[PDB]
Design a protein around this ligand. Structure first.
Ligand SMILES: Nc1ncnc2c1ncn2[C@@H]1O[C@H](COP(=O)(O)OP(=O)(O)O)[C@@H](O)[C@H]1O
Ligand SMILES: Nc1ncnc2c1ncn2[C@@H]1O[C@H](COP(=O)(O)OP(=O)(O)O)[C@@H](O)[C@H]1O
Ligand SMILES: [Mg+2]
Ligand SMILES: [Mg+2]
Lengths: 366, 357
């Protein structure tokens, strides 16, 4: 389930000693000089949604201060939630309202409530709503085989591989111990009791080893991983094709393979993103990233946040992406953070951020 | 396998726009005012070894800049590696040399090469070479609960607990589908139904046989003998007045003194610190299999009262088994305890590194 952001109030959150930003649907541009406090705005949003995870409040509390307060009004499934998360000199606290009425009141409940509502862990969610600095540029830069890799990372594949490997550890540990035992099996009372128990341990470990190995395969490449691929690929390919129509790409059919290779079927070829022209390469890259976000949540994303989406792009490409932005319609609320003033011409609502001597200020114009 | 650090060159890495530090064996003290750029030096070392973990390049690139470059020369098993990891405006890259000759050239290969070389994941390694500010202090004050706990936190019980959740969340998913299946079966690929019900089975077998104390156990039968052995070898080097030190299968220290077994919260204050460093150092040896080559203590003195800072200083004098012990701090005194001394001074947002005495 995807949310639509509505409003946030913050107290002593890094450079935002006292800010109150209201978001609207359509295309919102958050324009402000580098370091003016743009990104903090969202860290606070995510702080409001999941709170501390054990991290250090020294990182979000305004330097000098010893208390921070974030209040976020968002919307999931039409229902309007207000979540407040505060911290005052050691004493934490959090509460969650639903359509005006109290719903959760303890840090523990609120966290549980929030995850019950969104339907995904903090990471899955974060990747379905937040696109990091110049990601679309870094992507076109990766070698083809690295473009597959980051799709898998975004889907949480590597997550399971990482576990496949930890299980591997345990397996081997139990195997070397089965060697350390087999050897030991090859005063007189205890020597015999120990011998029996060494046999006993042998029966115990050779049993767990088999288990682990099976559950190790499930974390592996053709276990749950393959399953996840088999589940997302189709969804991504469906949204990839919607995007191609939306951003008006001259191809009637885009395919995503299990390995996550984007294949664009054209007249005389079955090309890859790298075969596309810079203009189209940008379009496809956004399409893919927007698709993944859809796949991570199930349906279509409500709100998508693009942090400095035009960062490592030349002057000509920045312009193309700007035009591609103008095409977006299928995403109720797209938030664009940037220092490029031009992008304002692509927004329905603009929010200006300007640091005033280590104190972020927010004004609405355009 | 443990490494010995030799040298690192960095470009636009946080406060180090252009620094080049050369490390030497024995005891190296990295002294510099708070915030002068000491710790970044090592973040860069670790950046050179594993690259952007899972990460935001905005965090390591000098503010204003849009490119960072780290070049680390280290040594594992006598072999001398030079690993270079760079990032220029979106375009990443990495290469690894071995004894002068190219060995790995792609980010993907280098990472794979590095892990093939060290023999442990980024975390296991990191804990076998980097003692985080406070760790020591945490062992002299934390309750007997925290201790025996915070110990396993080091052996990696956390990473194992995430896979514990994964497992439960994979059974949940397998059940969501096993559902759709039954649905479709009422209102050939019933074989998928078999594969899934079978996995949900294996998953629950391990899920229970490893519950909250599943890894707890596994850990005890892998690091404990070693933590002890190494914990002992430390007691000797430090000249502790005990012939033997036991490690309860619960990661608790049992010092053996003439008047029977003695506990940590009952030993000499000066030995408290001494024992604490021995335990931590031991845990580092266990994590890697053999004796650590290089051990980095980041501000190992913070949280200690005047007197204790002095004791630890003197216990650092005794450390001869570790070929390279790197001390980071903003306590000038400690330079007395160093063979080499690297000074770090921030010159208006730009770290500078000098060599002295
Ligand atoms: N803990 C803090 N207390 C007060 N100000 C902070 C804190 N942490 C960071 N800042 C300020 O916030 C700025 C960085 O904010 P950020 O939102 O990342 O900017 P932007 O996204 O506009 O590039 C820095 O300019 C810094 O001075
Ligand atoms: N990305 C960055 N670009 C430039 N300077 C940075 C960056 N990140 C941190 N710093 C600066 O470096 C200092 C922190 O460096 P650090 O090496 O952690 O210090 P120390 O270890 O001496 O306490 C802070 O003083 C901070 O202002
Ligand atoms: Mg930003
Ligand atoms: Mg430091």
């Amino acid at each position: 389930m995807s949310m639509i952001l509505k409003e946030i109030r913050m107290n002593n959150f890094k450079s935002h000693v006292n800010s109150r930003i209201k978001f609207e649907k359509g295309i919102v541009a958050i324009i402000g000089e580098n370091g003016s406090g743009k990104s903090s705005i969202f860290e606070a949003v995510f702080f409001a949604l999941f709170g501390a995870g054990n991290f250090n409040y020294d990182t979000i509390i305004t330097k000098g201060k010893k208390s921070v307060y974030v209040e976020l009004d968002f919307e999931v499934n039409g229902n309007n939630y207000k979540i407040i998360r505060e911290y005052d000199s050691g004493r934490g606290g959090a509460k969650l309202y639903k359509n005006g009425k109290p719903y959760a009141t303890t840090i523990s409940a609120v966290n549980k409530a929030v995850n019950e509502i969104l339907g995904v862990d903090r990471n899955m969610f974060l990747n379905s709503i937040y696109i990091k600095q110049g990601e679309i540029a870094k992507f076109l830069s990766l070698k083809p085989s690295e473009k597959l890799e980051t799709v898998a990372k975004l889907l949480g594949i590597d997550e399971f591989e990482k576990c496949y490997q930890k299980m591997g550890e345990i397996v081997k540990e139990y195997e070397k111990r089965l060697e350390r035992i087999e050897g030991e099996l090859n005063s007189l009372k205890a020597r015999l009791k120990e011998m029996s128990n060494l046999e006993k341990e042998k029966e115990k470990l050779t049993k767990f080893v088999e288990y682990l190995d099976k559950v190790r395969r499930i974390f592996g490449r053709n276990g749950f991983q393959a399953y996840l691929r088999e589940k997302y690929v189709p969804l991504i390919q469906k949204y990839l094709n919607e995007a191609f129509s939306e951003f008006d790409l001259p191809y009637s059919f885009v395919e995503l393979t299990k390995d996550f290779e984007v294949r664009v079927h054209a007249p005389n070829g079955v090309l890859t993103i790298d075969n596309l022209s810079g203009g189209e390469q940008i379009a496809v890259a956004l399409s893919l990233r927007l698709a993944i976000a859809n796949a991570l949540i199930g349906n279509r994303v409500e709100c998508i946040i693009l942090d400095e989406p035009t960062v490592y792009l030349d002057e000509n490409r920045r312009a193309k992406l700007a035009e591609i932005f103008r095409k977006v319609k299928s995403i109720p609320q797209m938030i664009i953070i940037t220092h490029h003033r031009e992008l304002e011409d692509v927004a329905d609502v603009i929010i200006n951020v300007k640091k005033d001597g280590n104190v972020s200020k927010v004004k609405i114009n355009g």
